[PDB]
Design an enzyme around this catalytic site. Structure first.
Site, mmCIF file in Angstrom:
data_model
loop_
_atom_site.group_PDB
_atom_site.id
_atom_site.type_symbol
_atom_site.label_atom_id
_atom_site.label_comp_id
_atom_site.label_asym_id
_atom_site.label_seq_id
_atom_site.Cartn_x
_atom_site.Cartn_y
_atom_site.Cartn_z
ATOM 1 N N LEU H 39 0.795 -1.226 0.000
ATOM 2 C CA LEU H 39 0.000 0.000 0.000
ATOM 3 C C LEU H 39 0.829 1.278 0.000
ATOM 4 O O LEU H 39 0.409 2.302 -0.541
ATOM 5 C CB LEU H 39 -0.901 -0.006 1.223
ATOM 6 C CG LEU H 39 -1.695 -1.301 1.294
ATOM 7 C CD1 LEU H 39 -2.505 -1.369 2.567
ATOM 8 C CD2 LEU H 39 -2.569 -1.449 0.070
ATOM 9 N N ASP H 40 2.003 1.197 0.616
ATOM 10 C CA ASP H 40 2.948 2.303 0.736
ATOM 11 C C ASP H 40 2.404 3.479 1.551
ATOM 12 O O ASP H 40 1.195 3.638 1.727
ATOM 13 C CB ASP H 40 3.388 2.800 -0.638
ATOM 14 C CG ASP H 40 4.528 3.793 -0.547
ATOM 15 O OD1 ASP H 40 5.044 3.983 0.573
ATOM 16 O OD2 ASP H 40 4.899 4.388 -1.579
ATOM 17 N N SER H 41 3.324 4.309 2.033
ATOM 18 C CA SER H 41 3.004 5.335 3.009
ATOM 19 C C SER H 41 2.029 6.374 2.493
ATOM 20 O O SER H 41 1.186 6.856 3.241
ATOM 21 C CB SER H 41 4.276 6.041 3.460
ATOM 22 O OG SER H 41 4.812 6.795 2.398
#
Ligand SMILES: CCCCCCCCCCCCCCCCCC(=O)OC[C@H](COP(=O)([O-])OCC(O)COP(=O)([O-])OC[C@@H](COC(=O)CCCCCCCCCCCCCCCCC)OC(=O)CCCCCCCCCCCCCCCCC)OC(=O)CCCCCCCCCCCCCCCCC
Ligand SMILES: CCCCCCCCCCCCCCCCC[C@@H](O)O[C@H](CO[C@H](O)CCCCCCCCCCCCCCC)COP(=O)(O)OCC[N+](C)(C)C
Ligand SMILES: CCCCCCCC/C=C\CCCCCCCC(=O)OC[C@H](COP(=O)(O)OCCN)OC(=O)CCCCCCC/C=C\CCCCCCCC
Ligand SMILES: CCCCCCCC/C=C\CCCCCCCC(=O)OC[C@H](COP(=O)(O)OCCN)OC(=O)CCCCCCC/C=C\CCCCCCCC
Ligand SMILES: CCCCCCCCCCCCCC(=O)SCCNC(=O)CCNC(=O)[C@@H](O)C(C)(C)COP(=O)(O)O
Lengths: 169, 275, 128, 119, 171, 59, 115, 85, 62, 78, 459
Positions: H39-41
């Site tokens: 999903l990443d930050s």
């Protein structure tokens, strides 16, 4: 109410005049009659006190002080003349203040007593108040603290010098 | 008195146009009402000036209490922008707020009328400075303005308060309270205007637009504010103009009259006096 | 956007706009490491103090005492005469009171000339 | 940062940047959260003026001078417009508009007695 | 609750993102428009330099900060618990520290035998425990770095500070 | 007495809506009854130029 | 605007009264009675010539315990009379307007005859 | 709403389910957030703010940095609301 | 009964007391209480008949 | 006495105004993951905004009628 | 009276002979009794000043002050008797003697009558208060403080002394009554001006004047509370009493010499109040509040209008009680936490309530709101001042601004807000504390019902 009947009373301008005018609707004010019953209790109650109050009535009466010769005629160094006359002058001063208190109270009376008019009988009291406050202003103005009869004298001679300086021209 | 009461109506109402607290808006409203009645004194008509208060209390207490119902209902979130659109969620509060807003608005036979119209009309027919009268006009417009703002965001929209809904209008004493104030809020204008002796001595002649003006200014208020508010609903991000930043910074006034003199004094009271 | 914020004594610039926030060199990073070092030193200390059973009573931090000391006792011993402070002190000192001296004295004289040479004296003002 | 040597007589005390306590991070867990200033950290000279509840020198989205100019200018315009308004009263006005604005006169009335019934 | 650390670029740009996004809701009001512009916004952050060399990137931030600061809105929505708050400390009138009860004198202390019993149990647990946190803190620590707190290893772990905070809405 | 739901808002009691509607209707009933009871938005006509014979001018 | 007449001025108004033979005497209606007005008190603002209708109104209003009910007929008498007066004090301004106007015309034309 | 831990874990997942990028079957209370799920930050910020928004609760940023495992989240709200359930 | 005793105290006692205090201060001293004195219209006074209507020269209506 | 959570599946986005928005992003091709959450609870259920002026006339439908009864009483008095 | 004064002497044998652990009760009980006996003096007369022996008299101006002064001893005892405990019996027994000896000098110096007797007692008061400040004050500075308290009195008092002797040579007796009667104006020249300052400066030092007040804060910072209550509530006020006395002479010269001191006062009030707005520590804050109020008294005396003396009396007493009250009320905190600095107290309200209530009442009457005798005392002198110069109001108003602020400030900073965490020291309010401050504040509130007995001679 002998006090109410006393000195303010001949000045007091009591008159009053109810109108009474019924019409088609029933009157709300009749409720006051029910409320009158609430007064009646206290009325009866007063007797229950007043009766006993009558039973024993040891009582006071007014004090008065004799006149004394004033400072103007006692000599420059007698302390006792200055003193007696000082106390007399002081009593007289406090008295005069009380009189101005009275005339102001009668002024307030006239003011509220008018419905909205005034500039009427209130002008009448306003005049006597004008004269009274004028002279009282004169007798007792810039004396300052430690007001003293010797000073009111010292002022009175000044106004009299104003008069003599006035007559010359 | 007139000179200042007018401009405080205006300057307050402008900030009232654009806030986000319920209560801040209602506050600016109440002060603006106060400026209005202040010119009512300054126009040399004290009796009506007093008359306006007696009406004013019901209105404002209505607003703050219904607002209290909203705020307590939601776990206390004053900010309208995440205040829900809950026209149906609390129908009784809705009714209340509606009659309230109409009363403050000055609807023709509702309680706020018997004050406001007589007031501003008397200001019209009186000899006076006119520019202030103009200010009374923009102000009475803005009354309708913010009064529609709070209605709009409080009720109309699809709701946007955070999910769960603890909402519960019910609790009978509250109901009875709002009830009684509604009762006064609708009858008191008529009853009291009737019962009081005619100290006013009425001015009722020229011209016809004289009486109309109080209504048309309101109508301009709702039309402009509402079409504007709907135009806010159409995407298109924009960034604020200077007027927005002004009127929404409460006129900048607190942020300058508080961060400045207090600094010069508290500094002075150490930079010099204490030291 | 175009307008650009302009910092003032009463409106310090936000940290996000500070140029120093951006330009950054390893020694400056040593500065932050240092600041965290001493800050962590002292806070570790304060926690060792804060919660062991035996303290009971208050434990004043030395810095606050240096401050309260420096708001009073240390002001005079330093001082130094300097013409800026001296003149500024004469100014705030004798200045405004002379100002009030004239401001009252003139009004007094005015009431004098009206009460005496004039006749605009107030009536009813018997209270005194 | 000494203030530095100067006749004000406060010497050898750190000069710290001005910063009302709002400016310092709320989310940090300060030793003294109301004061918001941990432990041994040296205290700003005018602590009390910045103590919060006092001066708040928090940064503002619109710049300071612009603030001052907009408001002071606003009050200025408000006043001048006001008084030019005062020059031209309703039912009198500037003569040009007065051609419409004229009305009433009207005010005169009362029994002649009222001229001295008030007197 | 995770103290300090001198700051780094990534978390920086991130906080700028959450921030700008929130002010962006504060403008867009409606859930609708806000959703649209939000997606447009993240679309801006990726469509721009989702990958790049640093020296350009910081400049991109310096751009972004300005572009935000101009649009930051006179007042964002703020949840009541938050430092803005409509009630940031409404309840700090109430959160009395525990040691204060330890003062009630017996006529009051008798009325809650249970709670006081359990409480002396605790206080005992602490006064017994403390020397261990002393030795451990003394142990794990170097001269004393930026980091705060240190892990449990067999018992207890400076707990009395946090564990016995007076909850959130005592009344 | 009321339950949280998570969208439904179980709007308790018809009586509530009965009340709300009752006061809104009460409002319009009043404004209209008062509107018929009188038209206070008007009263007596007024005019300006009138007639020169009433005043004065001669020549 | 020379033709326009200042509101503050009472008006050539004095001349105008003399100018209109019919208007004199003003003989303003005085059914109010000053001695009587004080008895009912009223207000200094409520002097007027319609004061007698006002006394009829306070009489009617005190006469009914119904309060809000009835006594609108008297209110309409006081109203209507107040209207007539406002009309009179309205027409007077038109009068000073037109008379100042004629003054300007006959002065301009006298300035023509004298060239 | 006196609130309970199950209510927290349930409402939390109930929000994580609706997010598109997560595939609902793969979601688990202990399911990791980067090493699992990509999903990443930049989306992490979305899931966290959108999630706190459900409660009206406020998340401090440095605590927002950890986050990751949903259990860590439910733990976090469990601490801040002091539910002890 | 709760409403009974409560109302008894809080509304019955104060009025008895304060009205008794009324006979004190008003009967005792002048100008303690100053009425506006009633408006007197054309209609006769209850004090002693009198009063009279004036002219009634007014004409037309509505 | 816990209330149950409704359903993950049940929040369709298709009836929402938001669907139009997702279309508009589809014009950009951009993905908007959150909508099924945002739109679900709010726009998509009970939501059906009352008209403004219609809200203002909340009581009119009955009030005009009771008013008719009132004027009916007026003529009845005649 | 000679009747009230003997027992006041008589407590001393009673103190010394009292059982070692009972003395506080002895001194307390009998001091209360003698207070009640003092109260009978209050009657006065509406005309002549009351008289007694050849060597005493009791003007209305003195009586409320005398009642107060008698009233304070028990209070100082209640405050002191826990502040000290570990002290040896002989030393404690020695200690209360200072206090009572002190009030004995006060009861003597209020009733006067010869202004030389009045002087010698006026200056005799200086010793016991010095001993108390110096031996039982805390921290080092007290030593230095002693000196400031001392010379500022003497440097003022000594010329006054010579001046007094002079007059009884240029005229007959120095006695007050006759000099009130034999009074004759002194005027301009230059010798007479130095006579003026000679007969004013000491009185204007003892009640601090703005240019000279420096010793006063530095006394209050140091003195043990029993010294503080007297040094604040009374000695200032007595300096005012004397200055009201000697103004029987002077005039018309006062008209010409008032101005400079009216400038130091009218400006010093706003100034000191301003400094008052930013103190580091409370115990000083109160002191500057005290100067900030005394300036009002001193202009009230110098404009010499009767309203101004009425207001003078009232404000003297009211400020007496309220200031003493704030001091004990601050010492309580200082004992509970030893902070002294105001910042450490923080959320004291949270941890205990009733003291917050006393903070409220006390500060509330400090700002003076109706109908506190403080307020009514102040409003008169604003009236007479306003008569003296219409501008003057613009100054007085600013005072009434700042005295609000800092007053509320001392409330909201040391109370409302979060508790400090680690300060476990506080221990839930003794009975004597509440008893004490209730004893300050109740008389102060009853007293409003009957001002007419406090306004003094020019009533
Ligand atoms: C005017 C003053 C003149 C000079 C007197 C100075 C007093 C000196 C003093 O008391 O020092 C004791 C004291 C010595 O300490 P200590 O260890 O308790 O000494 C044991 C006592 O001296 C001895 O303790 P003791 O308990 O054995 O003594 C008992 C005695 C107390 O005896 C004394 O200690 C002092 C004697 C008093 C002399 C009285 C002078 C004239 C009055 O109590 C009395 O009975 C006093 C006489 C009262 C009877 C009168 C009845 C008439 C009816 O001095 C101090 O430490 C503190 C004083 C600091 C300076 C201040 C000095 C003046 C204030
Ligand atoms: C009641 C309120 C009190 C208010 C304040 C009281 C008085 C304050 C004013 C003080 C008076 C003047 C003394 C100030 C210091 C002067 C002596 C010296 O220390 O000052 C020098 C500098 O100060 C100035 O030279 C003196 C300026 C003085 C002008 C102010 C006078 C204002 C008049 C005040 C009224 C006077 C009283 C009259 C009766 C009413 C510094 O010395 P130094 O460093 O080695 O040499 C100079 C260095 N150079 C060459 C580099 C310049
Ligand atoms: C300029 C010269 C003198 C002008 C000043 C006049 C008197 C000023 C009194 C200063 C003493 C106050 C010190 C203590 C106040 C304090 O610390 O409170 C801080 C607080 C700041 O926070 P806020 O923004 O207000 O609230 C929320 C902020 N987060 O400020 C205050 O509460 C104090 C506010 C007092 C402001 C004083 C100004 C009043 C005079 C203005 C009226 C004049 C109108 C304009 C005149 C122009 C006419 C042509
Ligand atoms: C170095 C630091 C220390 C130095 C300090 C400086 C102090 C300077 C004080 C000045 C002293 C002046 C001495 C002169 C006094 C004097 O002249 O008295 C004479 C005069 C009349 O004498 P006769 O012979 O009778 O003549 C009249 C008939 N021909 O004597 C009297 O009547 C009264 C005697 C009292 C004298 C005391 C005067 C001292 C008072 C100090 C005043 C200080 C000023 C304070 C100013 C503050 C105001 C803001
Ligand atoms: C209303 C307010 C309006 C605000 C306006 C904001 C406009 C901003 C314009 C866009 C500027 C930028 O995109 S700046 C960031 C670009 N810099 C970089 O990408 C540097 C490399 N570092 C990274 O990419 C990391 O931070 C990432 C994004 C965490 C990597 O992504 P992964 O998910 O880990």
């Amino acid at each position: 109410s002998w006090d109410k009947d006393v000195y303010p009373e001949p000045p007091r301008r009591t008159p009053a005049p109810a109108p009474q005018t019924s019409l088609p609707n029933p009157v709300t004010y009749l409720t006051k009659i029910f409320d009158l019953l609430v007064d009646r209790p206290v009325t009866l109650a007063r007797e229950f006190i007043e009766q006993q109050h009558a039973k024993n009535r040891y009582y006071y009466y007014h004090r008065e002080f004799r006149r004394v010769p004033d400072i103007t005629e006692c000599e420059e160094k007698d302390i006792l003349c200055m003193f007696e006359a000082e106390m007399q002058w002081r009593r007289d001063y406090k008295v005069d203040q009380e009189i101005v208190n009275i005339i102001q109270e009668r002024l307030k009376a006239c003011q509220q007593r008018e419905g909205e008019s005034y500039r009427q009988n209130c002008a009448k009291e306003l005049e006597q108040f004008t004269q009274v406050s004028k002279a009282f202003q004169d007798r007792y103005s810039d004396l300052g603290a430690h007001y003293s009869a010797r000073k009111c004298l010292a002022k009175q001679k000044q106004r009299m010098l104003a008069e003599r300086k006035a007559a010359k021209e | 008195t007139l000179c200042l009461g007018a401009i405080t109506t205006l300057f307050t109402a402008l900030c009232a146009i654009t806030q986000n607290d319920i209560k801040k808006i209602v506050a600016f409203s109440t002060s603006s009402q106060l400026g209005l009645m202040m010119v009512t004194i300054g126009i040399n008509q004290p009796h009506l000036a007093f008359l306006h208060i007696c009406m004013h209390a019901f209105f404002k207490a209505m607003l703050f209490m219904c607002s209290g119902s909203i705020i307590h209902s939601l776990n206390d979130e004053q900010d309208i922008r995440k205040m829900g659109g809950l026209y149906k969620a609390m129908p009784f509060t809705t009714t209340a707020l509606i009659i309230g807003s109409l009363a403050l608005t000055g609807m023709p036979y509702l309680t706020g009328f018997y004050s406001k119209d007589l007031i501003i009309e008397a200001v019209n027919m009186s000899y006076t400075n006119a520019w202030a009268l103009l200010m009374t006009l923009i102000a009475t417009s803005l009354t309708a303005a913010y009064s529609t703002r709070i209605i709009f965001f409080a009720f109309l929209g699809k709701p946007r308060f955070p999910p769960l809904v603890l909402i519960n209008e019910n609790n009978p004493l509250l109901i009875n309270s709002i009830k009684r104030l509604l009762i006064g809020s609708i009858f008191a204008g008529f009853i009291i205007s009737n019962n009081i002796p005619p100290m006013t001595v009425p001015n009722t002649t020229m011209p016809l637009y004289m009486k109309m003006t109080a209504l048309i200014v309101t109508i301009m208020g709702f039309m402009l504010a509402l079409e504007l508010n709907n135009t806010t609903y159409y995407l298109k991000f924009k960034y604020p103009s200077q007027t927005y930043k002004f009127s929404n910074m409460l006129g900048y006034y607190p942020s300058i009259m508080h961060r400045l003199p207090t600094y010069h004094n508290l500094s002075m009271s150490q930079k010099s006096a204490s030291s | 956007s175009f307008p650009k914020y302009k910092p003032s004594r009463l409106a310090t610039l936000p940290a996000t706009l500070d140029p120093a926030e951006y330009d950054i060199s390893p020694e400056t990073r040593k500065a932050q490491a240092e600041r965290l070092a001493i800050r962590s030193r002292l806070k570790r200390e304060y926690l060792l103090q804060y919660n062991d059973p035996n303290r009971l009573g208050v434990i004043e931090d030395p810095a606050l005492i240096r401050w309260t000391y420096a708001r009073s006792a240390n002001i005079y011993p330093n001082f130094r005469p300097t013409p800026k402070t001296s003149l500024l002190g004469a100014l705030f000192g004798i200045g405004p009171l002379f100002f009030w001296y004239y401001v009252f004295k003139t009004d007094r004289d005015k009431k004098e000339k009206l009460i005496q040479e004039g006749k605009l004296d107030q009536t009813f003002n018997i209270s005194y | 940062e000494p203030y530095p040597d100067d006749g004000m007589g406060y010497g050898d005390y750190p000069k710290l940047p001005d910063r009302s306590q709002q400016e310092r991070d709320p989310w940090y867990d300060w030793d003294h959260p109301d004061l918001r200033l941990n432990w041994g950290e040296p205290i700003h000279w005018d602590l009390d003026m910045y103590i919060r509840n006092r001066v708040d020198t928090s940064p503002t989205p619109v710049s300071w001078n612009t603030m001052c100019k907009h408001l002071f200018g606003f009050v200025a315009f408000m006043l001048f417009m006001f008084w030019v308004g005062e020059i031209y009263p309703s039912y009198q006005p500037v003569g040009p508009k007065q051609y419409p604005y004229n009305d009433l006169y009207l005010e005169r009335g009362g029994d002649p007695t009222k001229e001295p019934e008030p007197v | 609750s995770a103290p300090a650390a001198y700051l780094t670029h990534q978390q920086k740009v991130l906080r700028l993102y959450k921030r700008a996004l929130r002010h962006l809701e504060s403008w867009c009001v409606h859930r609708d428009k806000y959703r649209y512009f939000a997606c447009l916004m993240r679309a801006r952050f990726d469509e721009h330099k989702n990958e790049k060399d640093m020296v350009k990137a910081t400049q991109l931030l310096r751009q972004a900060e300005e572009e935000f600061w101009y649009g930051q809105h006179p007042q964002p929505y703020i949840f009541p618990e938050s430092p803005g708050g409509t009630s940031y400390e409404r309840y700090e009138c109430y959160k009395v520290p525990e040691w204060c009860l330890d003062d009630w004198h017996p006529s009051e202390k008798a009325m809650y035998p249970d709670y006081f019993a359990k409480r002396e149990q605790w206080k005992r647990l602490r006064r017994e425990s403390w020397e261990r946190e002393v030795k451990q803190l003394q142990e794990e620590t170097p001269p004393g770095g930026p980091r705060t707190e240190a892990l449990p290893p067999a018992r207890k772990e400076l707990w009395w500070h946090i564990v016995t905070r007076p909850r959130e809405r005592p009344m | 007495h009321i339950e949280p739901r998570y969208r439904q808002f179980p709007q308790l009691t018809r009586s509530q809506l009965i009340q709300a509607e009752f006061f809104s209707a009460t409002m319009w009933f009043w404004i209209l009854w008062r509107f018929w009871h009188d038209s206070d938005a008007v009263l007596g006509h007024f005019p300006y130029p009138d007639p020169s014979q009433w005043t004065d001018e001669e020549l | 605007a020379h033709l326009a007449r200042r509101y503050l001025g009472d008006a050539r108004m004095p001349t105008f009264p003399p100018d209109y033979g019919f208007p004199e005497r003003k003989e303003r209606e005085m059914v109010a009675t000053q001695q009587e007005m004080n008895d009912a008190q009223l207000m200094l603002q409520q002097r007027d010539y319609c004061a007698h209708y006002l006394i009829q109104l306070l009489k009617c209003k005190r006469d009914s315990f119904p309060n809000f009910l009835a006594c609108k007929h008297e209110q309409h008498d006081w109203d209507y009379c107040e209207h007539l007066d406002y009309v009179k004090r309205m027409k007077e301004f038109e009068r000073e307007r037109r008379l100042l106007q004629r003054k300007k015309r006959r002065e301009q034309r006298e300035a023509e005859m004298a060239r | 709403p006196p609130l309970t831990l199950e209510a927290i874990k349930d409402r939390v997942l109930y929000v994580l389910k609706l997010y598109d990028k997560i595939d609902p079957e793969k979601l688990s209370v202990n399911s990791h957030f980067m090493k699992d799920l990509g999903l990443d930050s930049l989306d992490q910020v979305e899931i966290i703010m959108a999630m706190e928004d459900e409660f009206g609760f406020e998340i401090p940023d440095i605590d927002a940095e950890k986050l990751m495992c949903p259990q860590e989240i439910v733990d976090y709200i469990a601490d801040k609301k002091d539910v002890y359930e | 009964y709760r409403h009974s005793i409560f109302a008894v105290t809080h509304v019955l006692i104060p009025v008895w007391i304060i009205h008794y205090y009324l006979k004190y201060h008003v009967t005792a001293k002048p100008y303690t209480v100053v009425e506006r004195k009633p408006r007197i219209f054309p209609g006769d006074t209850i004090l002693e008949t009198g009063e009279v209507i004036p002219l009634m020269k007014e004409f037309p209506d509505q | 006495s816990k209330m149950e959570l409704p359903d993950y599946k049940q929040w369709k986005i298709e009836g929402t105004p938001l669907e139009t928005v997702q279309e508009k992003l589809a014009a950009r091709g951009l993905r908007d993951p959150w909508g099924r959450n945002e739109a679900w609870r709010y726009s998509g259920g009970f939501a059906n905004n009352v008209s403004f002026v219609g809200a203002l006339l909340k009581g009119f439908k009955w009030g005009f009628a009771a008013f008719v009864v009132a004027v009916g009483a007026e003529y009845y008095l005649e | 009276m000679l009747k009230i004064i003997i027992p006041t002497t008589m407590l001393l044998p009673m103190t010394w002979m009292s059982k070692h652990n009972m003395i506080w009760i002895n001194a307390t009980v009998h001091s209360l009794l003698i207070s009640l006996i003092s109260l009978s003096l209050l009657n006065q007369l509406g005309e002549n000043s009351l008289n007694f022996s050849l060597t005493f008299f009791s003007d209305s101006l003195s009586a409320p002050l005398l009642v107060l002064t008698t009233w304070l001893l028990p209070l100082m005892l209640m405050a002191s008797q826990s502040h000290l405990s570990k002290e040896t019996t002989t030393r404690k027994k020695l200690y209360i003697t200072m206090l009572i000896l002190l009030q004995l000098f006060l009861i003597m110096t209020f009733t006067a009558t010869e202004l030389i007797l009045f002087y010698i007692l006026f200056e005799a008061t200086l010793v016991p208060t010095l001993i108390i400040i110096t031996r039982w004050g805390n921290q080092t500075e007290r030593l230095n403080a002693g000196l400031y308290f001392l010379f500022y009195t003497l440097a003022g008092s000594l010329p006054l002394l010579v001046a007094l002797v002079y007059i009884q040579n240029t005229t007959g007796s120095l006695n007050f009554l006759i000099i009130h009667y034999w009074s004759h104006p002194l005027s301009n020249s230059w010798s007479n001006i130095f006579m003026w300052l000679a007969c004013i400066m000491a009185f204007m030092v003892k009640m601090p004047l703005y240019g000279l007040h420096l010793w006063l804060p530095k006394a209050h910072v140091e003195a043990p509370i029993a010294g503080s209550m007297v040094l604040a509530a009374v000695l200032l006020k007595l300096g005012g009493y004397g200055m009201m006395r000697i103004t029987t002479i002077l005039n018309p010269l006062t008209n010409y010499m008032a101005y400079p001191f009216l400038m130091l006062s009218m400006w010093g009030m706003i100034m000191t109040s301003s400094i008052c707005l930013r103190q580091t520590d409370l115990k000083s804050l109160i002191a500057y509040s005290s100067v900030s109020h005394m300036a009002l008294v001193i202009v009230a005396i110098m404009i010499q209008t009767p309203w101004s003396f009425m207001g003078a009396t009232a404000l003297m007493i009211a400020h007496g009680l309220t200031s003493s009250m704030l001091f004990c009320l601050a010492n309580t905190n200082y004992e509970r936490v030893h902070s002294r600095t105001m910042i450490l107290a923080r959320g004291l309200q949270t941890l205990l309530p009733l003291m917050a209530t006393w903070w409220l009442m006390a500060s509330l009457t400090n700002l003076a709101l109706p109908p506190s005798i403080n307020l009514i005392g102040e409003l008169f002198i604003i009236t007479a001042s306003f008569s003296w110069s219409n501008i003057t109001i613009i100054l007085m108003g600013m005072n009434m601004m700042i005295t609000a602020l800092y007053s509320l400030y001392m409330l909201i900073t040391t109370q409302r807000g979060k508790y400090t965490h680690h300060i476990n020291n506080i221990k839930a309010s003794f009975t004597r504390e509440n008893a004490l401050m209730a004893l300050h504040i109740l008389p102060l509130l009853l007293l409003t019902l009957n001002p007419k007995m406090i306004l003094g001679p020019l009533y």
